[PDB]
């Protein structure tokens, strides 16, 4: 019903290796060349990646900023409201980004700000200009 274990013999393969006198040597060479071809392709991309790895040396260590640890506040200083309006102008509806810019406002307080100061800060106009870019 089935070939021995670790033995490989398909109807397709038998016909290919017995198509002529040296169809055996032909098939085994096409794969011998295919192996060499793929093997040097490996060292090529190995060499390419080796150079790319060296250009990333040091990482991003001299570019990291220390962690700003500030507690979330409920009240809006005029300063914070003005930061918000500008953050909306630059980020639109990315409530996470806006929250990070202001520093001490939760993602929900940011969403609340949108409805509360909606008319007074023409947030409709501010949002429609964000989409204009």
């Amino acid at each position: 019903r089935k070939p021995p274990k670790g033995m490989f013999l398909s109807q397709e393969d038998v016909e290919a290796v017995s198509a002529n006198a040296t169809a055996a040597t032909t098939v085994l060479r096409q794969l011998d060349m295919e192996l060499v071809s793929v093997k040097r392709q490996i060292q090529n991309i190995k060499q390419t990646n080796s150079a790319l790895k060296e250009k990333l040396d040091g990482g991003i260590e001299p570019y990291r900023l220390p962690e700003v640890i500030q507690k979330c506040n409920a009240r809006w200083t005029t300063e914070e409201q003005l930061l918000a309006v500008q953050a909306i102008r630059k980020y639109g509806r990315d409530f996470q980004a806006i929250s990070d810019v202001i520093g001490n406002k939760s993602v929900v307080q940011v969403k609340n700000f949108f409805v509360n100061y909606r008319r007074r800060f023409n947030i409709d106009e501010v949002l429609q200009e964000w989409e204009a870019e």
Partner: protein, 666 residues
């Protein structure tokens, strides 16, 4: 098996079913009620048991009926029919036994048997037992034919058959009780030794063997499951198939490597795209940090846009630093996945040069058993006689196999040194024309009712013929002769003054250097009481080594043995003999094999008797005149001694039926 059921097994018969031959002789019983069949079967089985329990004395009808019980001994004509059938077809009272009723005073019919091999001698004894006039014509100065035994001093070694292939259902088991055969079991263990002269470690001595067995099953799969049996109109051989299987195993090995290194490039190229994204991000981070720095240099107090710029760029920087860290995360995963794949590659090669050589020994061994290059064997049929293999350990005849044909030859009219030249067969009878081998011009004529031809297949194959048939054998017979394979294997007998090998090791292999020479002195036997080593020449080597002198052959033998046991532990041989079976004119080979393009049916065709045309036109259909026995005629046991023995018994039965009549079929 034991009892009456064991006796059936020991006679190669199903204990609970009637054979085709039995159906022919007892058509009344087999077509009749089941109860009678079981009575028949028991009578048959019990009679066999009686003969088997004591094969040194003749078992008569009287003695048989005496030891039978009710309700089996009630029908005496049934018992007489059964006994007669068994005696006629040589299932009981065959070989060498003491006769109770001394032979009939005058003989009926006259038979000439060509060749006093085992098949010839087996028939001769039977026909004489049936009261026929029998004369054997042997070309050699000895009986036995392909059972040849070298004898000198205390050195005794077989140049022909050597092994009893298991006693379980072997007619030679019966013979061995009748003849003083010193039967010694063969210990299976066979250590191999490479060209260098050093053992193959149990590690490799199993990778290769197991692979060999695996490669055989693979060819069987190619034959039966993929119907790969004809290629370019030519029939596929076992060798051809083994080569194709090996090539596909080498193909798969490469297929595996390709797709493994293909797994590497895909992952390596994922790394390339990631490192590009990382270099471009470290670029934006570099610039963005500068921008934040410059916005921080603007010292307070500042308006809200300037304050926003600091905060905005701060957010934008940590956001891009979030990404880069998640990209360095991915880099670690992909970077170790590459050390994963590079740690475990697939198989480098299918078989190494060392491996392929040890495999070639296993092929040589197979080429030895079948006495022929694997490229000659039929893929579909090469092992057609596997189902009929006997049970038990293989044994060797320690006192020399010749003891058997010599014992059979006793009390028989055998003309030695008599070479049959022509066989003439006509509706009225036969004449066999033979000459004296010593002075070939001295001619003999033999007139007989029947001829039993036991000429080897090699002889029958000769072109131009060594024996002429008048009229010529029919096309269906000669075509079978051509189609059938007649192989070759040779032996080298080495006689020493002392044992220098492992005495508890019966056989050990020597691995050749090339495929071409795999058969050359590949195996050595330690079987005899005396210090004798026996060297085998198989496969393509056999035919070639016959053109080389004995000294050169023994030279290569000593060379090999020195490599294995030490250059000073191997003395010069006191006596040496080399067989040349293909060269032998009375053999022209060693034994038959199922050639590519042949089948087991050809063995049946070989066994079919020849019936001459009528003398006077319009005269009734003549009696069959020319009969064939021998190793090459027995489909289920070819290329053996028991097979030859059995073919003799077969023909003697058929001939006696024809010329003395079958009184047991009524």
């Amino acid at each position: 098996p034991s009892g009456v059921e064991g006796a059936a097994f020991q006679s190669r018969l199903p204990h609970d079913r009637m054979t085709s031959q039995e159906a022919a002789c007892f058509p009344d019983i087999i077509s009749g009620p089941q109860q009678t069949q079981k009575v028949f079967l028991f009578i048959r089985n019990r009679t066999l048991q009686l003969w088997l329990d004591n094969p040194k004395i003749q078992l008569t009808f009287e003695a048989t009926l005496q030891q039978l019980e009710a309700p089996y001994n009630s029908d005496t004509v049934l018992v007489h029919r059964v006994h007669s059938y068994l005696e006629r077809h040589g299932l009981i009272n065959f070989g060498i036994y003491k006769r109770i009723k001394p032979l009939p005073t005058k003989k009926t019919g006259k038979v000439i048997i060509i060749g006093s091999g085992v098949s010839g001698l087996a028939a001769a004894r039977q026909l004489q037992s049936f009261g026929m006039d029998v004369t054997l014509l042997e070309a050699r100065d000895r009986v036995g034919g392909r059972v040849a035994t070298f004898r000198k001093g205390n050195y005794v070694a077989d140049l022909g058959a050597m092994v009893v292939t298991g006693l379980g259902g072997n007619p030679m088991a019966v013979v061995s009780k009748q003849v003083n055969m010193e039967l010694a079991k063969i210990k299976q263990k066979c250590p191999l030794y490479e060209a260098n002269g050093q053992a193959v470690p149990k590690e490799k001595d199993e990778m290769v063997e197991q692979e060999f067995n695996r490669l055989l099953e693979a060819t069987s799969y190619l034959s039966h499951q993929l119907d790969f049996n004809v290629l370019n109109n030519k029939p596929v051989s076992l060798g051809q198939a083994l080569e194709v299987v090996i090539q596909l195993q080498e193909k798969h090995v490469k297929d595996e490597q390709i797709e493994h290194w293909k797994k590497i490039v895909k992952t390596q190229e994922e790394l390339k795209e990631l490192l590009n994204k990382m270099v471009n991000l470290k670029e934006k981070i570099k610039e963005l940090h500068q921008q934040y720095k410059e916005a921080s240099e603007v010292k307070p107090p500042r308006d809200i846009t300037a304050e926003f710029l600091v905060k905005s760029k701060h957010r934008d920087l940590t956001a891009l630093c979030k990404e880069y860290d998640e990209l360095a995360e991915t880099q670690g995963k992909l970077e170790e996945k590459l050390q994963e794949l590079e740690a475990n590659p697939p198989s480098d090669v299918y078989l190494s040069s060392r491996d392929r050589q040890i495999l070639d020994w296993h092929f040589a061994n197979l080429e030895f058993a079948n006495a022929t290059p694997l490229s000659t064997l039929s893929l579909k049929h090469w092992d057609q006689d596997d189902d009929f293999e006997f049970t038990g350990s293989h044994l060797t005849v320690r006192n020399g196999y010749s003891c058997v044909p010599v014992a059979l030859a006793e009390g028989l009219d055998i003309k030695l040194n008599t070479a049959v030249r022509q066989v003439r067969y006509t509706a009225s009878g036969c004449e066999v024309i033979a000459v004296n081998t010593r002075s070939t011009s001295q001619t003999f004529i033999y007139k007989c009712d029947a001829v039993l031809c036991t000429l080897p297949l090699g002889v029958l194959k000769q072109q131009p013929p060594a024996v002429q048939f008048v009229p010529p054998l029919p096309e269906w017979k000669t075509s079978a002769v051509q189609r059938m394979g007649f192989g070759n294997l040779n032996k080298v007998v080495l006689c020493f003054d002392r044992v220098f090998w492992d005495p508890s090791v019966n056989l050990f292999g020597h691995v050749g250097s090339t495929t071409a020479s795999r058969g050359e002195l590949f195996l050595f036997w330690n079987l005899y009481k005396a210090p004798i080593l026996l060297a085998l020449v198989a496969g393509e080597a056999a035919g070639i080594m016959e053109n080389i002198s004995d000294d050169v052959i023994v030279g290569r033998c000593l060379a090999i043995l020195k490599g294995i046991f030490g250059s000073s532990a191997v003395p010069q041989p006191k006596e040496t003999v080399v067989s040349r079976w293909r060269a032998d004119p009375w053999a022209r080979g060693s034994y038959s094999y199922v050639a590519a393009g042949s089948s087991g049916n050809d063995y049946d065709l070989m066994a079919q008797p020849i019936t001459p045309g009528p003398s006077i036109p319009g005269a009734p259909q003549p009696i069959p005149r020319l009969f064939f026995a021998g190793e090459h005629t027995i489909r289920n046991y070819p290329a053996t001694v028991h097979g030859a023995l059995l073919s003799g018994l077969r023909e003697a039965g058929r001939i006696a039926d024809q010329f003395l009549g079958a009184m047991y079929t009524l």
